[PDB]
Design an enzyme around this catalytic site. Sequence first.
Site, short mmCIF file in Angstrom:
data_model
loop_
_atom_site.label_atom_id
_atom_site.label_comp_id
_atom_site.label_asym_id
_atom_site.label_seq_id
_atom_site.Cartn_x
_atom_site.Cartn_y
_atom_site.Cartn_z
N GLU A 9 -40.15 -18.13 -73.71
CA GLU A 9 -38.76 -17.73 -73.92
C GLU A 9 -38.44 -17.74 -75.41
OE1 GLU A 9 -35.92 -20.49 -74.08
OE2 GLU A 9 -34.20 -19.13 -74.06
N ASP A 26 -40.53 -23.03 -72.85
CA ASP A 26 -39.14 -23.17 -73.24
C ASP A 26 -38.92 -23.31 -74.76
OD1 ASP A 26 -36.25 -23.95 -72.36
OD2 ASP A 26 -36.88 -25.63 -73.61
N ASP A 50 -24.54 5.29 -64.47
CA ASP A 50 -23.64 4.54 -65.32
C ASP A 50 -22.20 4.82 -64.88
OD1 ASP A 50 -22.89 3.20 -67.61
OD2 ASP A 50 -22.86 5.07 -68.78
N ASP A 64 -24.51 -35.00 -75.49
CA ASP A 64 -25.66 -35.88 -75.43
C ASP A 64 -26.89 -35.26 -76.10
OD1 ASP A 64 -23.99 -37.57 -73.95
OD2 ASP A 64 -25.55 -38.02 -72.44
N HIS A 110 -26.62 11.30 -70.27
CA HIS A 110 -25.83 10.17 -70.71
C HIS A 110 -25.53 9.14 -69.62
CE1 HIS A 110 -22.37 8.07 -72.58
NE2 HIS A 110 -22.85 8.50 -73.73
N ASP A 111 -25.46 9.58 -68.37
CA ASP A 111 -25.12 8.65 -67.29
C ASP A 111 -26.10 8.58 -66.14
OD1 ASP A 111 -22.63 8.13 -68.70
OD2 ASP A 111 -21.82 9.94 -67.73
N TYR A 115 -21.59 3.72 -71.59
CA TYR A 115 -22.91 3.47 -72.16
C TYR A 115 -23.84 4.66 -72.05
CZ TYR A 115 -26.98 0.67 -73.47
OH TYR A 115 -28.08 0.13 -74.11
N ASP A 170 -36.51 -33.85 -82.43
CA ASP A 170 -37.44 -32.72 -82.47
C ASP A 170 -38.87 -33.12 -82.78
OD1 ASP A 170 -35.74 -30.35 -82.02
OD2 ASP A 170 -34.76 -31.16 -83.81
N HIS A 224 -38.22 -22.50 -81.87
CA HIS A 224 -38.15 -23.66 -82.75
C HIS A 224 -39.44 -24.44 -82.83
CE1 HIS A 224 -33.99 -22.62 -82.80
NE2 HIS A 224 -33.84 -22.86 -81.52
N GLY A 270 -19.37 3.08 -67.70
CA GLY A 270 -19.76 4.47 -67.78
C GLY A 270 -19.89 4.98 -69.20
#
Lengths: 179, 290
Positions: free
Chosen positions: B69, B39, B238, B2, B214-215, B110, B8, B43, B108
């Site tokens: 946003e 919102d 992590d 829809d 790192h974690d 990451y 626009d 655009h 972990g």
Amino acid sequence: LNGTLMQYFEWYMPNDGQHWKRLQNDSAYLAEHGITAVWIPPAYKGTSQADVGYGAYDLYDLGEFHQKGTVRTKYGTKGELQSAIKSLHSRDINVYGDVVINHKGGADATEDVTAVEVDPADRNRVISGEHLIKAWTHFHFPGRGSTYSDFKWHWYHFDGTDWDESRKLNRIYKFQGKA
Amino acid sequence: YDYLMYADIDYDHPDVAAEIKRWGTWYANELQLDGFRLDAVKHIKFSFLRDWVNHVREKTGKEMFTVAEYWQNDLGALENYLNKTNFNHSVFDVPLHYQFHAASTQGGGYDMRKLLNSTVVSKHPLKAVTFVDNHDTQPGQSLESTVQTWFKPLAYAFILTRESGYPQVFYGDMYGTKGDSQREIPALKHKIEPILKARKQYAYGAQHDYFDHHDIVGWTREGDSSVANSGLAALITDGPGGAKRMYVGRQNAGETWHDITGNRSEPVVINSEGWGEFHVNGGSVSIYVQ
């Protein structure tokens, strides 16, 4: 104290017109847990009662007039919304309204408009010559009339649409004739 | 499908711009709103949005906090937008959400140290609204990229107890989501409440970052004289659990702190110099307060 905001809605909540009451009832909890502001979902009339609010049909119909087959929005009526906001205010919580103004959905009727087709990749590059199409661009708000505002929408207040109702075709259209 | 029939709005049209500006004030006055959430700003004509926000504040004489946003996982695009709009409103920290998502899905693997860079909050702390998940990222939605539940409380401790950014809690995370997949977000309410408590009464004062691993990474808040017993030491991991010595301010030396999240029972005593050796379990979060 630290300010904390909460998005007070989720996509799949039930369409039972009780959301505003829920929020009003939730004010004490929110306040004791440090929420200082709540962002509420679109409060104005969508393309149907179940619309989450991004359909955006009538911005001046906050669940007040009978349009789209319902008076209230998915969340409730304007009065419930107002009662909810008053509870929030009594507890010093701020309310942030959602603003959906990129488009309008649920036009009351189509209008014969001249359009060109554009490239789906380069939505600027015209890949067709002008031709008449039928676009859902007419908004007159039969349920509201001119209460609060007498502005009516027409194809020229817009740039285009992605559906030609005549041929029932999905293409990217840009209205000509100064749209 | 829809949505294919929507139209626009053209903001080059004087009547449309004047109309949306006017409605804007009507909306604000009818509901007694305190601010807005913009919102799909990606655009919409940037200058219009900048003018509309100015207009509404002017006609109402209210502060009207506004967050837009601009969904782009790119700090460059967001920064440009901030410039084009004269920094007159904040944006949602899209990059930060995406890192949270990445960290949660890599079990972990990451590098937690990465959380500190490439985010709006890192560059523009006062123009960032930080969030974990929202209605477009939840299971089954158009921008689906849910932060895994186990990682969720760690993401919340991050946005709610650090000094930078205007944090946003999600309804779906608190009360769970009601969609119909087998991946729905459950009600984490009971796990976020303690973190909200920490933000409310302890996240005050100077901050000390310890993103040297790192974690296992953490940070502290020395507390502030204006808020009694304020101060905290947060640690999130992590992967594997562990410990970290962190400075909480010589001002609270000799105190016994406890993990407000309850994931850890052991108390930590702050030494004479204001330091503490805090502990966190694997794939867990620990927030010690007095």
